[PDB]
Design a protein around this ligand. Structure first.
Ligand code: CLA
Ligand code: CLA
Ligand code: CLA
Ligand code: CLA
Ligand code: CLA
Ligand code: CLA
Ligand code: CLA
Ligand code: CLA
Ligand code: CLA
Ligand SMILES: CC1=C(/C=C/C(C)=C/C=C/C(C)=C/C=C/C=C(C)/C=C/C=C(C)/C=C/C2=C(C)CCCC2(C)C)C(C)(C)CCC1
Ligand code: SF4
Lengths: 731, 175, 61, 119, 80, 31, 27
């Protein structure tokens, strides 16, 4: 309050430069401030949520504004296969002359928007720049609304009471109904009123959306339940997305499968889809009691699930108490569920490409998947990091008297021993088989390889109709129960998309699928060995049982008792962030090298040269970095010269991380003394004396900043290589 | 009770300008602190009086140069003849000034309880603009009641569409 | 209680929690931790011989 | 420096002109009769106390803590007694009733300005 | 300041005081052990927190625990 | 398309905003 | 595609900037 950390007086008394860094990194740590109690905490995170949401909508209004103003959006609408989607323009004063010829696309010098945004705005039904301006203003207004609320609920009499925050009971009555159920219903109110007619040629802007019904007859003879009229005449075959030719007029037809032409999902399928998800979520909103009293008390829902089998402790009696009073448990479930949702998003954006003329630009599809996978891994590691924060700064094993959680801390030894077992097994049985296949391929003999057919994935693709394997089971067999059971409904529009080898749906599978998917499960089980380790040994280990007393990110225990480098629950974060970047590494190298074989066409280039490691370092890193690393030559440059620069730049980020990760503090803490000796002793600079005393970075910060350069270097290197690689082999 | 109704004697109100009584049958003034609801009531009644005089005064047939109305609802012709002129954007935007600039701290005066939550000053009248006891309350009841009848009467002025599809003057030419 | 008795411990912060050990010393001189017990295996400080009270001191037969 | 920071002035006496080693580094002359030594921080000074005491008899030694307002303090010795030797004058502070085994969980210290061991 | 707290495992074997290079810890006559000694930490304002005590603390588990608290000029141990 | 606006906003937010914002935040350390 | 809407845009996010500093100097 006096100086800097206007929030912690334990850091304002510090004369060093640690008051700055810990003043920054403990700013959002609202549970550890001067005198901020519970009401003063929820009444601050609730306002900062609004500030956050307004930052999100300021950002999306940013994309709407630059696409509205510097992009080539409607020219892209004219030819979505040919013209590249432009991002915002450039103003460098550093582009001398030869750079500008490598960026001119029309009058603009803009970047090429490799983020899939024109596809989604083209399936929404935005066919102009004018709607992008009205939308951008429509989100500047919304960000002003959210900043108004966060400023407004920190105004004192509008700061809501904590009993309102502990209406945990009824947020689920309103999120599942209002946020999820209504809005998705409202999103059908977009798709029925905008995306279906502006895909079927009818420009239904903001004028005739009440005078032109999306079905030619609607809602006066349609409370009678004659709902097959809304799925009467589908858009069958002979249609191009955007015009009115070859298209019917039904709204909610569930054909299943793709377009024949744009290789995306039907918008009738999405209108019916979000409509059904909307109805089911609105039904799920009627789940819990309120002031009315028709629902479920959550205490009666966790208290009742104590098994009389008796194996599962004294049941969940104690769990509802440690979700209301806790937050890091609730944030751990939030990041867990959001993270599995992101990985589901990533595993479906390529597999079932939703957006017209995606899977035709092979860079934006390659960036959306990798984007949501690295964000997926970040949010899992957040779920376990706040898991360990829950077990340290939030866990009460007296309200959790022999609870399910206390049972978890009881058998955490068996948990960590068996995670370490499966991780060891997969690490001797991916690396064993890749070094086997790589030695054997190296010794003039690709035949003596171990290739195991991944028959379980091939059988599961046979359960979804991929007839290219010869199992002839539930959907691959055309005479079975499920094959007849949806023979009219959605099968023949969908098995065409399955049995095709053009689309990225249910890919053809060699033993690279086997060896890589074991490598992925190695990554998941190592990363949960670490995270579940320093989330269950977050509280106390047999090295030091004092760990719960020191908080989350305490540095160490000194050299005592053998040495104690990185014992904290923050280490599990600190190490499983490397395993996060690694595991999402192998996921996206595998995906990206699978689709550089599909999109090129030579699937045999993958399946012959991916079962061993020089297949990866040869056929994928050495070959596909060739149009990258030719980004600028001593003969000139091209448009990839940004990424080939960034690539190199990112290596310089990555290895600077090692300077903090490898080489720890007491080197630098006795080197800053040489620098401060030399600054104090010299003339003409001893006048300019510091105020904060120069001190080397503390060993939680140092491992953290080395981790941050490891992430930024890693992710910028691979975002350089995805985009420069696919943008070099194509576009 | 204090209410001229079934029963709820002075739940939280009773001195507010209900000249016929305090109505309040449902538990809003139980827990809503009543100053918020009073600012919302008065702001809704002002904007609804503007709405109903808008509908009637437009149904006396006046345009600078536009289409025939046939309605003052049903968005494309009326509303998106106006929006495609680039014209309603500012008539929203100045109210986007008015509420955020002189309505939001006005609402902060409706936070602390130091406002009498109508009161944007604004009496440009001589001989009848009494800020004191009698004419302020008995005229504020006039704004209140004419605003409430503006709310419902604007409700009917909207909802005469299904069996009508015409003007409300044409509704007066029908039974 | 007595010298030389094989004793399991019931204090969760010892290195030898739930491991039996031999009693070296029992002191009858009002010491809060009178019973010096050493072990077979050894903690991180290289030090098997520690000491305990009577409540954390379960003999066997 | 001496204008704003505490300079620690180790004073001691000896019998012979021996040679010790500075905590700055390098050998020092070691005046035989009585000598002071202005130092920077306390670990240097008591590291010199271990530098001398583990070699030979150097006793009747203590740093006067020169703080820049001017006055002194008496570190090390404090009570004409060596600190691991027991004098019956030092009043104990910094203890609790039991081991770590009865320390409260930090979910009981949560949202309060206490410590996890206070009981 | 680094709060050094000395629990009741402290059997008074003085490797803490002889191990601490700062004289924050002394020995106090305390009639609860066999040796009658138990360490104290009065001058924790000079406490670096290097945990050289907890290396040489031959108790069952660490009679003397050094909690890393505030960071003053002396507790940061900077030379200048 | 007001093409001149990046020639104003990209310098006045790219360089002079992390000059005066260094001043506001760094004096704001001592306020 | 025009210029005046860009001015209107930086007006609205300038006001939104005033709500950003307005929220920022209270928490
Ligand atoms: C989940 C709710 C949701 C969301 C996110 C959107 C989002 C959008 N709608 Mg919208 N819409 C919705 C529900 C929704 N709508 C409903 C329920 C209806 C029926 C009343 C409409 C009717 C509608 C029309 C008629 C138009 C939009 C348009 C738009 C786009 C620009 C809007 C703008 O400028 O501000 C934007 C993507 C505009 C658009 O896409 O431009 C062609 C447009 O003209 N919407
Ligand atoms: C119907 C009423 C209603 C509604 C709409 C909301 C809405 C909201 N509340 Mg809320 N709330 C309500 C009633 C309601 N509340 C009540 C009654 C209470 C008291 C009991 C609360 C108490 C409360 C608290 C205490 C908090 C909120 C918060 C929030 C915000 C959540 C953050 C967010 O935007 O996530 C948006 C999330 C989604 C849109 C969906 C995410 C996940 C889906 C499955 C994935 C997305 C779908 C799709 C696949 C992707 C589309 C993307 C596109 C590009 C394709 C949100 C605006 C929080 C907040 O941020 O404060 C503002 C908060 O802390 N509320
Ligand atoms: C929440 C979203 C939403 C909203 C606000 C509206 C709003 C409207 N719809 Mg509607 N509609 C929706 C979703 C929505 N619809 C969905 C999901 C479907 C598909 C089942 C339809 C199918 C539909 C038909 C078939 C008709 C309307 C009609 C109408 C209009 C008069 C009633 C009104 C503007 C009528 C109209 O005039 O269309 C504009 C009409 O005939 N709607
Ligand atoms: C919505 C999600 C969410 C929320 C609310 C929180 C909230 C919190 N987390 Mg957190 N966390 C999350 C997600 C989330 N986390 C995820 C997804 C991860 C995994 C990556 C973590 C990992 C994590 C750790 C490891 C820790 C927290 C901690 C905390 C608490 C204090 C944070 C603080 O003061 O930071 C202050 C703000 C900052 C430090 C700014 C962030 C800057 C980061 C470090 C680097 C970014 C720099 C950027 C890359 C450089 C740009 C250059 C360009 C070239 C890229 C707070 C309750 C801490 C805690 O509770 O311990 C006491 C803690 O130690 N979190
Ligand atoms: C090339 C880099 C590399 C490799 C191979 C590993 C490998 C492993 N790490 Mg790992 N790690 C790395 C980098 C690496 N890490 C980095 C950079 C970090 C961040 C610091 C971590 C952080 C980390 C954590 C935090 C954890 C691991 C764990 C593990 C083990 C996972 C279980 C498993 O797969 O066992 C299979 C075994 C192997 C893959 C070993 C390789 C097989 C060898 C080469 C053959 C045996 C020797 C051979 C005969 C040659 C003889 C040599 C000659 C001189 C005679 C595995 C040994 C976890 C663990 O212990 O799991 C039980 C664990 O908790 N790692
Ligand atoms: C415990 C380690 C382990 C883990 C985590 C996985 C994980 C996975 N395997 Mg799997 N696999 C394993 C061991 C393991 N496998 C072994 C030992 C074999 C035999 C060589 C296989 C053979 C195999 C095939 C053929 C396929 C997978 C696939 C997969 C993936 C999908 C899930 C699945 O089908 O479950 C499979 C689960 C099991 C096989 C059970 C494993 C658990 C036991 C304990 C392993 C040890 C069994 C032991 C060696 C057998 C005893 C001898 C017996 C013959 C008498 C998933 C990544 C599929 C895939 O890649 O699709 C993406 C796939 O098609 N696996
Ligand atoms: C942990 C690391 C750390 C941190 C966080 C700080 C933080 C701080 N130091 Mg500092 N310092 C450190 C280590 C650190 N120092 C070390 C190791 C030394 C050597 C002993 C010093 C010596 C030192 C002195 C002598 C002074 C500071 C001062 C300051 C404060 C002002 C920022 C400043 O002068 O740097 C800003 C960064 C620079 C000056 C970089 C110089 C080199 C640049 C790149 C060249 C300029 C090129 C170009 C023209 C830049 C234009 C763009 C720009 C204007 C945005 C700030 C609180 C000042 C202070 O306390 O005054 C109130 C002060 O006078 N420090
Ligand atoms: C925006 C909608 C809105 C809001 C917030 C209020 C809010 C309020 N009205 Mg109200 N009212 C409304 C619309 C609204 N009204 C409409 C449309 C009508 C006409 C049916 C009325 C007719 C009405 C009467 C007749 C009375 C209220 C009264 C009240 C006050 C207390 C009772 C209550 O909660 O109701 C409260 C300030 C009572 C009041 O002010 O006490 C004297 C009262 O007697 N209202
Ligand atoms: C993010 C914002 C940003 C912006 C807008 C600029 C802009 C510029 N940089 Mg630059 N730079 C930046 C970040 C930025 N830099 C960073 C982060 C670094 C470190 C990597 C550098 C490192 C760098 C170097 C090493 C050099 C530049 C140079 C230049 C100038 C280009 C010379 C030219 O062709 O113009 C034509 C030139 C002119 C029209 C003359 C303009 C001269 C000055 C800038 C205007 C008058 C200044 C005035 C007296 C003071 C007013 C306030 C002032 C702060 C603007 C240009 C003004 C070059 C330079 O020095 O040019 C002067 C140069 O050699 N920059
Ligand atoms: C530490 C911690 C934590 C953690 C975190 C997380 C991260 C978790 C995990 C979790 C996760 C991360 C999740 C996952 C889940 C799982 C699942 C969910 C699976 C299953 C699957 C399934 C279910 C599928 C199947 C199917 C199919 C395939 C089709 C048909 C049908 C079905 C659906 C059946 C918590 C917070 C909790 C607590 C506290 C602490
Ligand atoms: S804390 Fe560091 S300095 Fe203070 S006593 Fe324990 S070890 Fe010696």
């Amino acid at each position: 309050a006096t100086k800097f950390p206007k929030f912690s007086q334990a850091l304002a008394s510090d004369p060093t430069t640690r008051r700055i860094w810990y003043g920054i990194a403990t700013a959002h740590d609202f549970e550890s401030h001067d005198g901020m109690t519970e009401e003063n905490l929820y009444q601050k995170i609730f306002a900062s949520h609004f500030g956050h949401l307004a930052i999100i909508f300021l950002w999306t209004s940013g994309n709407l504004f630059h696409v509205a103003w510097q992009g080539n959006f409607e020219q892209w609408v004219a030819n979505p296969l040919k013209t590249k989607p432009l991002a915002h323009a450039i103003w460098d004063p550093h582009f001398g002359q030869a750079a500008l010829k490598a960026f001119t696309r029309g009058d603009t010098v803009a970047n090429i928007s490799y983020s899939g945004v024109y596809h989604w705005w083209y399936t929404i039904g935005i066919r102009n720049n004018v709607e992008l301006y009205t939308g951008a203003l429509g989100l500047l207004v919304l960000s002003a609304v959210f900043l108004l609320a966060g400023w407004l609920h920190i105004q004192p009499k509008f700061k809501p009471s904590l009993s309102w925050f502990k209406n945990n009971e009824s947020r689920l009555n309103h999120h599942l109904a209002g946020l999820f159920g209504v809005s998705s219903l409202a999103w059908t109110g977009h798709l029925v009123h905008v995306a279906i007619p502006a895909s079927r040629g009818q420009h239904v802007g903001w004028d005739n959306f009440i005078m032109t019904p999306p079905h030619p007859a609607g809602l006066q003879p349609f409370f009678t339940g004659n709902w097959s009229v809304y799925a009467q005449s589908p858009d069958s075959m002979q249609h191009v997305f955007g015009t009115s030719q070859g298209a019917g007029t039904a709204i909610l037809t569930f054909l299943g499968g793709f377009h024949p032409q744009t290789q995306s999902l039907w918008l009738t399928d999405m209108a019916h889809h979000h409509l059904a998800i909307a109805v089911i979520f609105i039904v799920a909103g009627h789940m819990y009691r309120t002031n009315f009293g028709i629902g479920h008390n959550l205490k009666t829902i966790l208290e009742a699930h104590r098994p009389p089998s008796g194996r599962l402790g004294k049941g969940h009696i104690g769990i509802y108490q440690t979700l209301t009073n806790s937050l890091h448990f609730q944030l751990g479930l939030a990041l867990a569920s959001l993270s599995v949702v992101t990985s589901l998003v990533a595993q479906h954006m390529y597999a079932m490409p939703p957006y017209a003329y995606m899977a035709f630009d092979y860079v934006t599809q390659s960036a959306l998947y990798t984007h949501h996978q690295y964000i997926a891994g970040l949010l899992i590691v957040g779920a376990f990091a706040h898991g360990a924060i829950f077990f340290i700064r939030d866990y009460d094993p007296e309200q959790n008297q022999d609870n399910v959680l206390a049972r978890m801390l009881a058998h955490k030894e068996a948990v960590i021993s068996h995670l370490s077992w499966v991780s060891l097994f997969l690490g001797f049985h991916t690396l064993g088989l890749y070094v086997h296949n790589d030695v054997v391929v190296a010794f003039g003999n690709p035949e003596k390889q171990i290739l195991i057919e991944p028959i379980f994935a091939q059988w599961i693709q046979a359960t979804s109709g991929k007839m290219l394997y010869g199992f002839q089971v539930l959907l691959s067999s055309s005479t079975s129960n499920a094959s007849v059971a949806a023979q009219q409904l959605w099968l023949p529009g969908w098995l065409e998309a399955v049995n095709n080898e053009s689309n990225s749906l249910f890919l053809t599978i060699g033993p690279g699928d086997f060896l890589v998917h074991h490598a992925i499960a190695l990554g998941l089980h190592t990363t949960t060995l670490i995270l579940v380790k320093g989330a269950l040994d977050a509280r106390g280990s047999k090295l030091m049982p004092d760990k719960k007393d020191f908080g989350y990110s305490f540095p160490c225990d000194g050299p005592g008792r053998g040495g104690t480098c990185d014992i904290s629950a923050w280490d599990a974060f600190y190490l499983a962030m490397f395993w996060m970047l690694n595991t999402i590494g192998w996921v996206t190298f595998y995906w990206h090298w699978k689709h550089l074989s599909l999109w090129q066409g030579n699937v045999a280039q993958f399946n012959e040269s991916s079962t061993y490691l020089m297949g990866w370092l040869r056929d994928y890193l050495w070959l596909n970095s060739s149009p990258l690393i030719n980004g600028y030559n001593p003969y000139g440059m091209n448009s990839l010269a940004v990424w080939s620069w960034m690539f190199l730049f990112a290596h310089l980020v990555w290895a600077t991380g090692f300077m903090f990760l490898i080489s720890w503090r007491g080197y630098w803490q006795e080197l800053i003394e040489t620098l401060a000796w030399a600054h104090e002793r010299t003339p003409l600079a001893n006048l300019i004396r510091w105020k904060d005393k120069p001190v080397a970075l503390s060993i939680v910060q140092a491992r953290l900043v080395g981790l941050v350069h490891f992430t930024v270097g890693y992710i910028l290197t691979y975002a350089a290589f995805v985009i420069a690689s696919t943008a070099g082999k194509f576009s | 009770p204090s209410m001229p109704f079934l029963k709820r004697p002075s739940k939280l109100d009773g001195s507010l300008p209900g000249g016929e009584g305090c109505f309040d049958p449902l538990g809003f003034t139980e827990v809503f602190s009543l100053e918020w609801l009073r600012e919302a009531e008065i702001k809704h009644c002002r904007v609804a009086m503007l709405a109903v005089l808008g509908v009637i005064a437009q149904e006396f047939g006046t345009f600078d140069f536009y289409n025939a109305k046939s309605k003052l609802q049903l968005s494309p012709d009326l509303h998106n003849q106006f929006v495609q002129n680039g014209a309603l954007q500012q008539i929203l935007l100045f109210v986007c000034a008015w509420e955020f600039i002189v309505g939001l701290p006005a609402l902060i005066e409706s936070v602390n309880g130091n406002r009498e939550p109508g009161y944007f000053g604004f009496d440009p009248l001589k001989l009848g603009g009494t800020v004191g006891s009698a004419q302020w309350k008995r005229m504020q009841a006039g704004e209140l009641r004419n605003g409430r009848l503006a709310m419902i009467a604007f409700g009917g002025f909207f909802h005469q569409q299904l069996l009508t599809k015409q003007g409300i003057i044409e509704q007066l030419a029908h039974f | 209680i007595k010298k030389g008795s094989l004793v399991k411990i019931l204090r969760p912060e010892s290195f030898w929690y739930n491991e039996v050990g031999t009693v070296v010393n029992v002191e009858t001189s009002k010491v809060l931790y009178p019973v010096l017990v050493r072990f077979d295996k050894v903690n991180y400080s290289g030090l098997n011989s520690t000491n305990f009270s009577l409540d954390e001191l379960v003999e066997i037969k | 420096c001496a204008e704003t920071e505490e300079k620690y002035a180790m004073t001691w006496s000896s019998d012979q002109q021996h040679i010790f080693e500075m905590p700055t580094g390098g050998a020092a002359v070691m005046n035989s009769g009585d000598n002071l030594l202005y130092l920077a921080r306390k670990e240097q000074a008591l590291a010199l106390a271990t530098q001398l005491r583990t070699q030979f008899k150097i006793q009747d030694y203590k740093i006067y803590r020169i703080f820049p307002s001017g006055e002194v303090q008496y570190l090390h010795p404090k009570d004409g007694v060596l600190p691991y030797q027991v004098n019956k004058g030092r009043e104990q502070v910094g203890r609790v009733k039991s081991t770590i085994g009865k320390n409260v969980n930090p979910a009981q210290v949560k949202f309060t300005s206490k410590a996890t061991y206070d009981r | 300041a680094h709060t050094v707290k000395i629990y009741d495992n402290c059997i008074g074997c003085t490797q803490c005081v002889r191990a601490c290079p700062l004289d924050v810890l002394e020995m106090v006559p305390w009639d609860g052990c066999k040796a009658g000694q138990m360490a104290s930490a009065p001058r924790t304002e000079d406490c670096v927190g290097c945990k050289r005590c907890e290396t040489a603390c031959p108790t069952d588990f660490l009679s003397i625990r050094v909690y890393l608290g505030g960071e003053t000029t002396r507790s940061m141990g900077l030379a200048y | 398309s007001a093409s001149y606006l990046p020639s104003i906003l990209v310098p006045t937010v790219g360089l002079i905003l992390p000059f005066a914002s260094m001043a506001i935040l760094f004096i704001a350390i001592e306020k | 595609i025009t210029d005046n809407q860009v001015f209107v845009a930086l007006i609205m996010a300038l006001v939104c900037g005033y709500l950003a500093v307005k929220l920022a100097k209270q928490l």
